[PDB]
From Swiss-Prot:
Keyword hit for Thylakoid: no
Activity control note: Inhibited by the cdc6-2 protein. The ATPase activity is not stimulated in the presence of DNA molecules.
Name this protein carries in UniProt: Minichromosome maintenance protein MCM
Reaction(s) catalysed (UniProt annotation): ATP + H2O = ADP + phosphate + H(+)
Mutagenesis / variant outcome for changing A414R: Predominantly monomeric and loss of helicase activity
């Protein structure tokens, strides 16, 4: 009925904008120049112009949007009439609308309404095509004319056919002519609820969504994504279950946005004061190290550090051959607990963006892969449900021992440049897993790692170990002797250490991890103290013609100079002096 073409063309062209310089005509220009069909308009720019526009769009989106889209194309042809032949209908898409509904709680009254959803994107199918509008011609003495099949609506997955056609008004033979038929690009993805949002009970919810036209290959699995879509249902036909609607859900995606750095940040607000009161000059390093330990002390002086360190940052990114392998990967192989990671892993479950995968791997990937069948008829999905879900976070993997035979060739990649190269002919993609890996594994027979070399003990890997930075063993504890206070620590007393606040449990996370606003490039005397260590360690080995394997600093000089520099990323802004001493120590301890 009522018509907003007026407001539309009187908006895009007349809108002032950030610089108070005409925008949305300029976006239009780039669009017509680059042969792209999408118009991304901010909702806050509309609400700062016309409010009623919002309500009508967002609630009547179903019918209103395509109207506005065609109405735009008209204005676009008369800026550049040669825009024909290349595009049929440009798209109008809205970013950052007010209604953002968690995929967990979804009203059944929200079908056909415009909404936004936060979540992580896990499974994605390959690019496919479909018929947008099919053009048929009727063979008989009463027709000999052409027509489009989905009148006033759109056609479905499986295409329908005669008998009756409007032209002549009879049944008969119908030939499809691809000459006039319009086609559309197609893809399907699965948004899983965020590991944070997930209550301890039940399981993360999932939503099936459909990426159309140029939205294809916009989002890659493992991404932290916000989408804006219009929900729908198809079914046709539901089989098997049961649970629970019974409505196949359909999200037709208008827009996707991958924009963020760490948006999982639980809060800053008041807590900025508290973590800054926590950056106090006191030996904050040692106490913070005492915090992750609790409540257990065994032979941990090295490990307490290595974990504290692993939880922290240090990621230089250079456009020429990106080299990071930061976010230090540590592996503790020990006999059956023995307290193992059954405790320390649980403490490394208190952390941001933390993926705990118990055993080899869950979800039929465990690191990454492409899958068969599974909804269905032979639909091919590409899904990686483990190590690339920890992107910008820690993947705590217990029992590496059981790792899939096929996967040990994938980690060579995902632990090196932190990408996964995948070509199964379903697609060729580089998945982004920047995750730190804190690992654990059983040895071959009980506790074997005293006499036998620490290699060959962990079974599967011969090399992957080289792709770890700090690997520790769990001492059998023959010589403990210290265990009076050390054990009674918490079995009665609340108090343990001089600080005794121990940064709580959450709070230690609200700073130590949740705070990487720090980017400490080390300089000056540090640069030297590490070097004199480099030459002395090297020459110490290379002086002996016996070839003692070189002590292997050559690649490691890289990741020591990650460790230290970014070990004392612990609320130290760019400042690095004696931090070196700590790292060079534990590495000289390690190399030998
Ligand atoms: Zn006919």
């Amino acid at each position: 009925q009522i018509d907003y073409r007026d407001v539309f063309i009187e908006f895009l062209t007349t809108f002032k904008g950030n610089n108070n310089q005409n925008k949305y005509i300029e976006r239009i220009n780039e669009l017509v120049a680059y042969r792209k069909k999408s118009l991304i308009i901010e909702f806050s720019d509309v609400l700062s112009f016309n409010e009623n526009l919002a309500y009508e769009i967002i609630n009547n989106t179903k019918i209103i949007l395509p109207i506005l889209e065609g109405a735009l194309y008209d204005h676009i042809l008369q800026l550049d009439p040669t825009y024909q032949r290349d595009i049929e209908k440009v798209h109008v898409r809205i970013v950052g609308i007010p209604r953002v509904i968690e995929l967990r709680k979804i009203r059944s009254t929200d079908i056909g309404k415009l909404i936004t959803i936060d979540g992580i994107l896990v499974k994605v199918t390959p690019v496919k095509e479909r018929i947008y509008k099919a053009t048929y011609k009727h063979i008989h003495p009463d027709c000999m004319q052409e027509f489009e099949w989905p009148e006033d609506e759109e056609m479905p997955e499986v295409l329908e056919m005669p008998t009756i056609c409007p032209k002549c008004g009879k049944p008969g033979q119908f030939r499809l002519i691809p000459e006039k038929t319009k086609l559309i690009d197609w893809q399907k993805a699965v948004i899983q609820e965020r590991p944070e949002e997930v209550p301890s009970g039940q399981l993360p919810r999932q939503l099936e969504i459909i990426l159309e036209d140029d939205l294809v290959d916009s989002a890659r699995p493992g991404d932290r994504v916000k989408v804006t879509g219009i929900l729908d249902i198809k079914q046709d036909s539901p089989v098997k279950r049961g649970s629970r609607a019974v409505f196949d859900i359909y999200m037709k995606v208008s827009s996707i946005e991958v924009s963020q750095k760490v948006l999982d940040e639980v809060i800053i607000s008041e807590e900025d004061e508290k973590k800054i009161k926590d950056l106090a000059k006191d030996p904050w390093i040692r106490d913070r190290i005492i915090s992750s330990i609790a409540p257990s002390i065994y032979g941990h002086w090295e490990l307490k550090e290595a974990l504290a360190l692993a939880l922290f940052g240090g990621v230089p990114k250079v456009l020429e051959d990106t080299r990071i392998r930061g976010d230090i990967h540590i592996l503790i192989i020990g006999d059956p607990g023995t307290a193992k990671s059954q405790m320390l892993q649980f403490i490394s479950r208190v952390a941001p963006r933390a993926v705990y995968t118990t055993g080899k791997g869950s979800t039929a990937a465990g690191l990454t892969a492409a899958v068969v069948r599974e909804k269905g008829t032979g639909e091919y999905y590409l899904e990686a449900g483990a190590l690339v879900l920890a992107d910008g976070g820690i993947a705590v993997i217990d029992e590496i021992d059981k790792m899939r035979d096929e996967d040990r060739v994938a980690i060579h990649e995902a632990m090196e440049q932190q990408t996964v190269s995948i070509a199964k002919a379903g697609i060729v993609a580089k998945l982004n897993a920047r995750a730190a890996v804190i690992a654990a594994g059983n040895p071959k027979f009980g506790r074997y790692i005293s006499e036998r070399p620490v290699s060959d003990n962990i079974n599967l890997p011969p090399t992957i170990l080289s792709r770890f930075d700090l690997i520790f063993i769990l001492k059998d504890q023959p010589g403990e002797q210290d265990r009076e206070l050390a054990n009674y620590i918490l079995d009665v007393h609340s108090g343990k250490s001089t600080k005794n606040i121990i940064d709580i449990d959450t709070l230690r996370k609200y700073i130590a991890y949740a705070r990487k606003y720090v980017t400490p490039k080390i300089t000056s005397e540090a640069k030297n103290l590490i070097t004199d260590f480099f030459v002395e360690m090297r020459k110490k080995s290379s002086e002996t013609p016996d070839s003692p394997i070189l002590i292997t600093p050559r690649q490691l000089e890289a990741l020591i100079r990650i460790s230290e520099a970014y070990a004392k990323m612990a609320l130290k802004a760019e400042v690095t002096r004696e931090d070196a001493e700590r790292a060079i120590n534990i590495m000289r301890l390690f190399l030998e």
